[PDB]
Structures are given as structure tokens and as C-alpha cells.
Amino acid sequence: ATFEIVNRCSYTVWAAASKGDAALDAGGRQLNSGESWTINVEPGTNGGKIWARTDCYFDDSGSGICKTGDCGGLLRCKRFGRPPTTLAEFSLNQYGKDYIDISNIKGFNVPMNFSPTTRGCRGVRCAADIVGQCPAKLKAPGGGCNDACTVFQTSEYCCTTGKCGPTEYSRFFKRLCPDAFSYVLDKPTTVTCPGSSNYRVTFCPTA
Numbered sequence: 001a002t003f004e005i006v007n008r009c010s011y012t013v014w015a016a017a018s019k020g021d022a023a024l025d026a027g028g029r030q031l032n033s034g035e036s037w038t039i040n041v042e043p044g045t046n047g048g049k050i051w052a053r054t055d056c057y058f059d060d061s062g063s064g065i066c067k068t069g070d071c072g073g074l075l076r077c078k079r080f081g082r083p084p085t086t087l088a089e090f091s092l093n094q095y096g097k098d099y100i101d102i103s104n105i106k107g108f109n110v111p112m113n114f115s116p117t118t119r120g121c122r123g124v125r126c127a128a129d130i131v132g133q134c135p136a137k138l139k140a141p142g143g144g145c146n147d148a149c150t151v152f153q154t155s156e157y158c159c160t161t162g163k164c165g166p167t168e169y170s171r172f173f174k175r176l177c178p179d180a181f182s183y184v185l186d187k188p189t190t191v192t193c194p195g196s197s198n199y200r201v202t203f204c205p206t207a
Ligand SMILES: O=C1O[C@H]([C@@H](O)CO)C(O)=C1O
Pocket: 029, 030, 031, 032, 035
């Protein structure tokens, strides 16, 4: 599957793509404002994520740090990124269908649109100004708006028992972005697409 990753932000981002225990395609790349990076994701990839990272520094070996979404210090990510991260999530070729969503379960750093470029389903979007509106106790100094699980590490926020409800904090993310997961047991906002669809992830879509 083809994913075109487009940075419409005014600022540089470092895109990342992983399934948790491996890179997808090269795993990461710099995108200056306006740049597009096209990757290939293997069919059948389960549990893939794409995200942006902000305020990164890398040396010539591709090691360094980002203020949001750092993945073990690597330019090419192999693992998931440090919150806060707005997440484009996908599982491809699962019994004939693809499943896409946007999540704020790991917080929010950059606004996002995640849409198919082929026919048969609709896209999803979280483009509200979550960072500017973020509750004081969730604000990350690095940039971004942390989820409550990251901040407080409770069973209720992290839904560790598989028993949890919405919270004051999850409802904030839900109010600003109804079409994204706000907590682990949120009513799903997953979209079912035809198997082997292709996609575009746009950072800062309203920019
Ligand atoms: O880091 C980058 O890589 C590409 C190009 O320079 C070679 O792939 C690009 O446009 C970036 O900002």
C-alpha cells in the first residue's frame, strides 16, 4: 500500500512510520513545510502507525532527539514514539478490509487528516487546536497535549483492567476531535476501507 505523507504545517516535522517492533518503509524522514514523502507499507500490516515528530536534532548517523514523538532517538523509527503524538493507525488486509483511525490516546502534537486516495470509504480528521486549548495539567512543555494516562498513570486513564470510562480529560479530546479515539474504550471511530486501499496522511490539513 502506498501512503503519501504530506506536511502542510508551516514548520518542519519528522514523519515516522512503525508497527511497534519494526519500521514501515524507511521508518522516518524529515518533511519541510510543503514536502511529501511516499512510502510503501506491506500488505497485511497489522497495528501500523504514522505520526509527526517536532523539534528534532539528528547527527550524521541519524541519532538524536525530538521534543515530541521521539522513537528511541532514531531518525528512522523502529518503535513507537514518545507521547504526545497524534496517531494515524491502520491495519491492512484484515480479512479482506483495511481499518483506519486517528487516535488521541497517546496525546496530540500536530493536527492530522488521514484519508484514502482510492475509492470506497471516507477519511478521518483531527485538526482542531488541541495544543492551544490543552488543559493545564496535560500541557507538555516540549510542545503538545498529553493524554491523561501518560500524565497520571492510573488504571482509570490507562484502561489497564479493560474497565474504564470517559474522563474529564478524555472528554476534552473528544470535544475538540469527535472523530478520533479519546480513550481506550471510546466508541470506535474506525473506518472500514476496501482491502489494499492507498492513503494520504496530511499534517496541518487546514494550514
Ligand atoms: O530529509 C529529506 O529527504 C528528502 C530528500 O532530500 C532526499 O530524500 C527531503 O526532501 C527532505 O527534507
